[PDB]
Design a protein around this ligand. Structure first.
Ligand SMILES: O=c1cc(N2CCOCC2)oc2c(-c3ccccc3)cccc12
Length: 850
């Protein structure tokens, strides 16, 4: 109430990018209600987290040491280098030593502090073997030395937190007064009607319409729509989905039972959303644009105040039930399916992998059945004792499930995840909040909790939520609330860092878009815009631009001043900015700059989402002991059609390589690529390792790009580094010739296949591909749900079942390893037939605008 907290709220909203306090666009107090109930889990988390380990955010894994890593360590002994002001000595110890033992034994080698990584804010502290430290492992895989500088621990005082019924059997019914819209489309003579639906888990319980009338600024009806489902049957989380067809054009939703288990009555003037299926169609939020959006007026039974108060087998038949429990996640169920599935509730409760199927066979539209379902969840021994399955858990948090308890059990198994895992899945869990029927939920609380309990998670949770608040008006309110609750308990240091980051970004957002303004339809990096570019950075770098700030996609990296010289404007289409900074950390064991790219034009949430499935993929290969050398570079969506991207050093586009050894034409030489790498690394040893890198990097992207359904793209959207690593890029948007994945002649060439014959490295390729293509099939269900969620919360279009199903054909579900093994190796053949065919077509399409 004072001026203190008042100003505090002011800045909080500036970091969120939305005024959470705002109450102009709401028909109830669910938001504020949610802000208050979060205050508890927040404070409860702040108090329970050790200030020390928290301030140092140790990054560890309790997973085994992979086969490819176990291969490098020589008899439980690793070499590390410790630094201290010019002084540098190497000490080899067992991979099982504790960071304390590394110090205790240190003091007794040469005649209070902590071991940090040189150039990064990464501390190796805690009761864990040095082998369980991600950094340590990263160095091993890349075959790099482990240089650590001994300095003083960060004062855990910098993370200080500031001062703090079922008897109304009457049928349900709702009256539609009329829809209103200030202006209508040019093409007149239209017909429209209101379709009122009783939704739940995306399935329709009941449906009613109105008499189709001509389309005009005002279209009254004053018609009562009486449904069938009794008020006693309305389940918590049911939505009254009101829609309008002309084709569906506008839609709006409203929870029938509020956050207090009360019914909904009274008059309502809901401002609808327009349609350009997907997460947005499910939002309870109303459209803020009240001066241009279509509105609708309704009325709910002005009754009293109802309150939904809180609560042997024929062997052969079995074989039938099982055939369902073993059915892929995409194949729907039939009448008999659910009926047969339901009847044997307790028998289907013995196998976890059946829950998704079982719970979707429930008639939530019947109060009786719901009550029984909960009786089932009473004895969850079989579930609570089951081993966590992220795949399965996810399946319960999608659009198909709107029941609190059901979803709550999924969230309940997530609690079992260690910080390392929470980070692999963070993006998808954050996107899953969109399927929650209320703003306050088990999942919303779980993200808050885990964010406040670890700085890394908290860091990415900030950015992920922030991207949705800045771009999504459908969910920003709910997300603005979840963020606030996080910024109110992350500490004063993090609160400060986020400020520096937001500041730097906002200042670079202006340039990025102000520079693109000059020439857009014709890529011509003017000689004047070059001087005008460096010049703008000059104004910013004056004293308003934060000297130092953490790189959003790589929190451990601290960026300093801008190396204005190396900064430029890429001669691309959307004219992105190529910036470079110095590493703010003076203990950095190098001088290399930090490259960051700012682009406008492409939706960077897609790239974000895509790069994340990749991380998961690499992780999956880790379990099956495999390394494909993917390079999922950092990418963060910051706002509408804009964000940053990590810059991979010593890397070039595969097209530019052909456009230099040949020219700006479509004639592609097969030996060009190899000639490039050879002259890049004269040292035979490097070239010998660079060629093998390609073999793996190339294979790795071929499988991932295929399963994801994005293997067919131009040559310019693909890169290779001077170390031989090939990696795809720019995932903005993605009768004729087609190809499964890019495996051009110049690639095969570098593998030995100078023509259409087998080779040494080439055989290694096919061996690794198939090998990785199988490692992913073991996680078919996990990929299905991910690919499925990604399309519902990452694609502007109204993706359908046909869209998701592709993932099922790519993974060849229902087949044996043999059939699948050959299937993949044949796709590799489809590429051997096209050769340069496809690439040449992409050249005619993009370059020649044909
Ligand atoms: O999204 C993108 C990611 C990248 N990357 C990935 C990380 O390392 C640096 C290159 O590069 C892009 C380029 C580009 C810049 C310089 C040279 C060639 C191409 C043009 C347009 C979009 C992207």
């Amino acid at each position: 109430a004072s001026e203190e907290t008042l100003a505090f709220q002011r800045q909080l909203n500036a970091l969120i990018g939305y005024d959470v306090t705002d109450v102009s666009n709401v028909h109830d107090d669910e938001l504020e209600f949610t802000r208050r109930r979060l205050v508890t889990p927040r404070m409860a988390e702040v108090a329970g987290r050790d200030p020390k380990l928290y301030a140092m955010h140790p990054w560890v894994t309790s997973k085994p040491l992979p086969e490819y890593l176990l291969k490098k360590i020589t008899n439980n002994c690793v070499f590390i280098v410790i630094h201290r002001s010019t002084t540098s000595q190497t000490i080899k110890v067992s991979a099982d030593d504790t960071p304390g033992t590394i110090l205790q034994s240190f003091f007794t080698k040469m005649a209070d502090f902590v071991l940090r990584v040189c150039g990064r804010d990464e501390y190796l502290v805690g009761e864990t073997p040095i082998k369980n430290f991600q950094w340590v492992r990263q160095c091993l895989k890349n075959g790099e030395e482990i240089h650590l500088v001994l300095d003083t621990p960060p004062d855990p005082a910098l993370d200080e937190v500031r001062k703090e019924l079922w008897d109304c059997d009457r049928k349900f019914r709702v009256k539609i007064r009329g829809i209103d819209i200030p202006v209508l489309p040019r093409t007149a003579d239209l017909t429209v009607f209101v379709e009122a639906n009783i939704q739940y888990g995306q399935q329709v319980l009941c449906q009613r319409r109105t008499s189709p009338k001509p389309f005009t600024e005002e279209v009254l009806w004053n018609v009562w729509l009486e449904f069938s489902i009794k008020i006693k049957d309305l389940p918590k989380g049911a939505l009254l989905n009101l829609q309008i067809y002309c084709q569906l054009l506008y839609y709006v939703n409203l929870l029938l039972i509020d956050h207090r288990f009360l019914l909904r009555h009274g008059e309502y003037v809901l401002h609808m959303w327009q349609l350009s299926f997907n997460a947005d169609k499910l939002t309870s939020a109303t459209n803020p644009d009240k001066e241009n959006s279509m509105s609708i007026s309704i009325l709910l039974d002005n009754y009293c105040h109802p309150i939904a108060l809180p609560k042997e087998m024929p062997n052969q038949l079995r074989k039938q039930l099982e055939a369902i429990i073993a059915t892929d996640p995409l194949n729907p169920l039939t009448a008999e399916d659910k009926e047969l599935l339901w009847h044997f509730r307790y028998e289907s409760l013995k196998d976890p992998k059946a829950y998704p199927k079982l719970f979707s066979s429930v008639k939530w539209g019947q109060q009786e059945i719901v009550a029984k379902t909960y009786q089932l969840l009473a004895k969850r021994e079989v579930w609570d004792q089951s081993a966590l399955d992220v795949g399965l858990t996810m399946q319960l948090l999608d659009c198909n499930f709107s029941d609190e308890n059901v979803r709550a059990i999924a969230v309940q198994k997530l609690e079992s995840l260690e910080d390392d895992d929470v980070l692999h899945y963070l993006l998808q869990l954050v996107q899953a909040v969109k399927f929650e029927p209320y703003h306050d939920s088990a999942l919303a609380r779980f993200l808050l909790k885990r964010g406040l309990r670890n700085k890394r998670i908290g860091h990415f949770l900030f950015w992920f939520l922030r991207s949705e608040i800045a771009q999504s008006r459908h969910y920003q309110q709910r997300f603005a609330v979840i963020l606030e609750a996080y910024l109110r308990g992350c500490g004063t240091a993090m609160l400060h860092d986020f400020t520096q980051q937001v500041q730097v970004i906002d200042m670079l957002q202006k340039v990025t878009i102000d520079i693109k303004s000059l020439s857009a339809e014709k890529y011509d990096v003017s000689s004047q815009v070059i001087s005008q570019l460096k010049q703008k950075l000059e104004n910013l770098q004056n004293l308003n631009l934060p000297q130092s700030f953490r790189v959003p996609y790589d929190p451990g990296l601290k960026a300093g001043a801008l190396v204005i010289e190396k900064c430029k404007v890429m001669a691309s289409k959307k004219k992105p900015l190529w910036l470079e900074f110095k590493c703010a950390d003076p203990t950095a064991l190098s001088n290399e700059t930090i490259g960051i790219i700012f682009k406008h034009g492409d939706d960077l949430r897609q790239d974000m989402l895509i790069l994340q499935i990749l991380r998961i993929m690499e992780s999956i290969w880790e379990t099956e002991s495999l390394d494909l050398c993917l390079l999922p570079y950092g990418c963060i969506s910051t706002g509408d059609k804009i964000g940053m991207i990590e810059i991979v050093k010593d890397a070039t586009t595969i097209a530019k390589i052909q456009q230099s050894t040949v020219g700006n034409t479509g004639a592609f030489k097969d030996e060009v690529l190899s000639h490039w790498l050879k002259e890049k690394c004269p040292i035979e040893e490097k070239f010998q390792a660079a060629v093998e890198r390609f073999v793996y990097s190339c294979a790795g992207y071929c499988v991932a790009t295929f399963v994801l359904g994005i293997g067919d793209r131009h040559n310019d959207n693909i890169m290779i580094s001077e170390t031989g690593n090939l990696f795809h890029i720019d995932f903005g948007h993605i009768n004729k010739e087609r190809v499964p994945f890019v495996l051009t002649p110049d690639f095969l060439f570098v593998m030995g296949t100078s023509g259409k014959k087998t080779s040494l490295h080439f055989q290694k390729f096919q061996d690794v591909c198939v090998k990785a293509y199988l490692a992913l099939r073991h996680h078919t269900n996990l990929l299905i749900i991910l690919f499925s969620m990604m399309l519902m919360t990452g694609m502007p279009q109204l993706t359908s079942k046909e869209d998701i199903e592709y993932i099922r054909d790519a993974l060849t579900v229902g087949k044996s390893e043999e059939d699948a093994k050959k299937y993949f190796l044949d796709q590799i053949e489809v590429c051997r037939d096209k050769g340069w065919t496809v690439q040449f077509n992409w050249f005619l399409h993009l370059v020649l605008g044909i």
